[PDB]
Design a protein around this nucleic acid. Structure first.
Lengths: 122, 119, 22, 104
RNA sequence: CGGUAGGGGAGCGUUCCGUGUUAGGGAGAAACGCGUGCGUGAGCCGCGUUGGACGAAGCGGAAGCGAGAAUGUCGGCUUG
RNA sequence: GGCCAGUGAGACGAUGGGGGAUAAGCUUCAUCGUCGAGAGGGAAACAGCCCGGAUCACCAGCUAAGGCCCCUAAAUGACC
RNA sequence: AGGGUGAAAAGAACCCCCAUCGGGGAGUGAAAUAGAACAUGAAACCGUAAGCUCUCAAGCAGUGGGAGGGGGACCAGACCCUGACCGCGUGCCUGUUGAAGAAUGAGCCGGCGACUCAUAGGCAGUGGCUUGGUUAAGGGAACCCACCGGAGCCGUAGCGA
């Protein structure tokens, strides 16, 4: 876990969300920023500034180039909920909960090792 | 009455039941009750399989030879076979020693000609 | 003369034992 | 060699080169040699078969590998009609053998 | 030597106290794993990690002495 | 004889008799056994029927009841 | 309902992304895998990654036998973790002659929650004394509830209104 940046106490959810990060996982820093800008989901934010947050900083803070960057870890967890009350019928069948999210991803270089070799007689 | 505070005491009375539950398929290893009804099974069946383990093979040995009888010649019964050794005087070659059928079937072939001579 | 091995063995009371059964 | 000795109530075909967790052998101490002339079956080319109980000649020789209850299996039972949960561990020195001399 | 209600006969552990500013600890309690060794059993002993302070061997004494169900109580957290 | 109990609406099968049509695992008594406070083997599956009535381990043998074509081990064994 | 970061807060300048909410670094501290949701922070619950099993197989599904596979072994010696398949196999408790259920109670977890105490009497074990044994109130220069106090109660002879 090289660089891990994001936040908490988000106004989103844990169900509707996450389904967006599960698609950017194992994807480069580009293949992830070219899909979010097309995702008609609210989860796209502040998850949009997220992929950009994990990056950029890891460029001047650590020795990580803009390329070879791939979302290694990513998961949405439920934080603190608030027990609200809403009338309906004598007030009894109610609890209410606001599943907040505080995802925490991380970026890192990519392995891979290519070394093509051929013979060219002349 | 302010008890002596169970605290960690009642904490060890449940986790100990969890350690035992670390190889079950269902969720009978993530709840004291789901395991409670699970341990009892491995508490009764265990008291059975221990005595059943002997019987479980009692049928096996006989089945091992049974599958070896339908090829030789004594299509009758392996009982007469045991009867031969009984009337003979061979306290060996037991249901467990019947493993001579699968491996080295040359030794189990000798007794085949010794049972006929006796009876 | 005490044996320097960390562990005295005098003879006091230690305990009043028990008093009957039940 | 296909030997059939007696552990007191058990009669395995203990093939030379393998160990057998026998019962208690008060007669034999730790790392001591044991001989059971009660063997029935014998390898030597063709599986020989003696008449009178056990064998009259030859025998089995080996050395015990220390006695110990190995692992407490801890047997137990249970009842439904009434809560009766009890546990009991069985020792059993499971004294292992050895032997090596093999033959057809 | 199956065993309910019951009767009788033996013990472990927890808080505290007497025997203890003796001894163990910052070269370090508590929380979790493991060695799956040990006892008939509830458990005990040793130890790694984490973690942050004291706790407490043995016998006895005094207990508000360990519950997964009493449409329990309080709080938190699943499912539809 | 003394200390502490528990339990008083039990059920079923065989046998000997009252109730009902000698109809009911129905009901009410006596006797024995089982269940009820003991599994298991067998009757396909049925606690109360039958055998046998479990300190424990054991890839150890022989039997009871019930069976032996296959399915779950065991005679399409012999004679009429 | 709601307790305590640390010894003192030095409780976080500046720098980078964002709407000058939020986070990550740079630093301070023995610690912030202690920083205002903050100490040690388990369980129920909710996820990621890794090994194995997983579409022709079914019934509170574990257990006994048990192949293969991903690793760890020993200079074979056939073992330590997952488990295809196979023989059996209808939770617990309470209440009942009798249920697994269409008998009932229970969503899960932590904590919490049911024969204790006073006086007196009758027994059992044990201890001191002994046909004798033993006090209650009170007094007390009391490291101490001792001593004194035996007023009183119980027993060895009983029986009868």
């Amino acid at each position: 876990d090289e660089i891990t940046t994001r936040g908490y106490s988000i106004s989103m959810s844990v169900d509707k969300a996450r389904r967006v990060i599960d698609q950017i996982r194992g994807r480069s820093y580009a293949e992830t920023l070219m899909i979010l800008e097309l995702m008609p989901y609210r989860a796209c934010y502040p998850i949009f500034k997220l992929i950009y947050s994990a990056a950029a900083n890891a460029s001047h803070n650590k020795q990580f180039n803009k390329a070879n960057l791939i979302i290694s870890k990513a998961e949405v967890n439920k934080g603190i909920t608030l027990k609200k009350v809403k009338p309906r019928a004598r007030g009894r069948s109610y609890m209410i909960l606001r599943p907040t999210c505080h995802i925490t991803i991380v970026l890192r270089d990519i392995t891979h090792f290519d070394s093509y070799d051929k013979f060219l007689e002349s | 009455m302010t008890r002596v505070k169970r605290g960690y005491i009642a904490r060890r009375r449940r986790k100990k039941i969890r350690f035992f539950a670390s190889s079950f398929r269902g969720a009978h290893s993530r709840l004291t009750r789901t395991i409670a009804q699970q341990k009892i099974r491995a508490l009764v069946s265990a008291h059975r399989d221990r005595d059943r383990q002997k019987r479980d093979f009692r049928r096996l040995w006989i089945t091992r030879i049974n599958a070896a009888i339908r090829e030789r010649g004594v299509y009758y019964n392996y009982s007469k076979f045991i009867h031969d050794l009984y009337k003979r005087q061979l306290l060996l070659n037991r249901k467990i020693l019947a493993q001579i059928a699968i491996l080295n079937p040359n030794c189990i072939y000798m007794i085949y000609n010794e049972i006929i001579k006796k009876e | 003369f005490r044996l320097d091995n960390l562990g005295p063995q005098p003879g006091s009371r230690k305990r009043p034992k028990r008093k009957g059964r039940g | 060699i296909f030997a059939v000795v007696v552990i007191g109530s058990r009669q395995y075909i203990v093939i030379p080169g393998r160990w057998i967790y026998t019962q208690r052998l008060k007669g034999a101490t730790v790392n001591d040699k044991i001989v059971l002339n009660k063997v029935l079956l014998v390898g030597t080319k063709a599986s020989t078969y003696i008449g009178t109980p056990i064998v009259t000649n030859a025998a089995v020789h080996a050395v015990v590998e220390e006695q110990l209850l190995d692992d407490k299996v801890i047997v137990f039972k249970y009842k439904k009609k009434k809560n009766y949960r009890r546990n009991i561990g069985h020792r059993q020195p499971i004294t292992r053998i050895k032997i090596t001399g093999i033959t057809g």
